[PDB]
Design a protein around this ligand. Structure first.
Ligand SMILES: O=c1ccn([C@@H]2O[C@H](COP(=O)(O)O)[C@@H](O)[C@H]2O)c(=O)[nH]1
Ligand SMILES: [Mg+2]
Length: 177
């Protein structure tokens, strides 16, 4: 059987995650009931951001609050202000971080992200549903254990999707941003 991705999302992500992901989609004219593969990808990326985070979370916040927090950091510190909202701030390494979760080739996604943000200061850390990862300057920020826990959660999501006949389509549907 092929299950419903909306039903999977609502049952297999934390509701706080789901709600924030709905907001994020409603904000850009996308319907979580329609673009369900995207809805799941959005929840996944949110969960990864929250797992990864020492850190200020930017992702998930209303855009007004998110920019307020970003500007607040950029002038408590003196870090260059990003052109696009990042996902986190690392107080230890004094840098913003963009987090990616991809079902495509990690190098492909990494450079897409590098080319969009055009920043020499923002760190990029990409995770795949395969266990592969790629991070700016081969600086992985977190310890082995913390990153293996992220990759393990990605395997759980994938296998749960597979269980419901959802992985095939989900894995094939990612486009460039
Ligand atoms: O609140 C959000 C908004 C986006 N995303 C996921 O991250 C993607 C890109 O966000 P970023 O990788 O540019 O942060 C979003 O389109 C979606 O795939 C989230 O997890 N939470
Ligand atoms: Mg983001």
């Amino acid at each position: 059987p092929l299950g419903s991705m909306e039903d999977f999302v609502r049952q297999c992500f934390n509701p706080m995650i789901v709600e924030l992901a709905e907001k994020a989609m409603k904000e850009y004219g996308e319907d979580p009931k329609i673009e369900t593969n995207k809805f799941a990808a959005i929840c996944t990326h949110l969960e990864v951001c929250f797992m990864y985070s020492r850190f200020e979370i930017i992702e998930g916040r209303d855009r007004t609050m998110a920019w307020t927090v970003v500007n607040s950091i950029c002038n408590t510190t003196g870090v260059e202000k990003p052109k696009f909202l990042p996902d986190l701030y690392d107080y230890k390494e004094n840098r913003f971080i963009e987090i990616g979760v991809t079902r495509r080739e990690v190098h492909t996604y990494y450079l897409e992200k590098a080319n969009k943000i055009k920043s020499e200061k923002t760190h990029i850390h990409i995770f795949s549903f395969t266990g592969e990862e790629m991070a700016t300057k081969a600086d992985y920020t977190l310890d082995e254990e913390s990153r293996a826990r992220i990759k393990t959660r990605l395997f759980t999501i994938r296998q749960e999707m597979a269980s419901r006949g959802l992985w095939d389509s989900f894995r094939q549907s990612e486009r460039g941003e």
